[PDB]
Amino acid sequence: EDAMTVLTPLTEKDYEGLKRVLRSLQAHKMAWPFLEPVDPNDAPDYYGVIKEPMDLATMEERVQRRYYEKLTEFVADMTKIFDNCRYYNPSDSPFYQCAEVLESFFVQKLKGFKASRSH
Numbered sequence: 001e002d003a004m005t006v007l008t009p010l011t012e013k014d015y016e017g018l019k020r021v022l023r024s025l026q027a028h029k030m031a032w033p034f035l036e037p038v039d040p041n042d043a044p045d046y047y048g049v050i051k052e053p054m055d056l057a058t059m060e061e062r063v064q065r066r067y068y069e070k071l072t073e074f075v076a077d078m079t080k081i082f083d084n085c086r087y088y089n090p091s092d093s094p095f096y097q098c099a100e101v102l103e104s105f106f107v108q109k110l111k112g113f114k115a116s117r118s119h
């Protein structure tokens with residue numbers, strides 16, 4: 001991550017772009033496992049092995065409250081969604097697959113966002 005990712009405070013116009021990124025991932029056909037927090041009745045050990053859970057609804061709450069001060073911090077929470085999934089699930093599970101797909105989409109949208117920031 002370069003000069004501007006780490007450093008640059010997020011402005012109000014930057015926040016309009018982060019909302020748009022987040023809604024694109026929420027609309028993706030492969031987002032379904034990540035839309036809301038993991039239900040412990042589906043995976044009763046999940047919260048004993050994943051130390052820092054994340055999901056897209058918590059990220060939306062944080063975006064609305066202006067939680068994030070730098071782009072790096074938003075990227076960090078998104079990345080955790082995907083890393084948590086690939087650590088918990090085996091490499092041949094549909095959940096692991098979805099993480100693969102959705103992370104590649106995220107990177108495409110994040111590059112779009114960075115390009116838009118300064119011009």
Ligand SMILES: CCNC(=O)N1CCN(C(C)=O)CC1
Pocket residue numbers: 033034038039042043046084085088089095
């Ligand atoms: C839908 C229920 N199926 C499950 O076994 N899981 C596994 C853990 N998980 C994620 C997102 O990592 C979702 C819940």
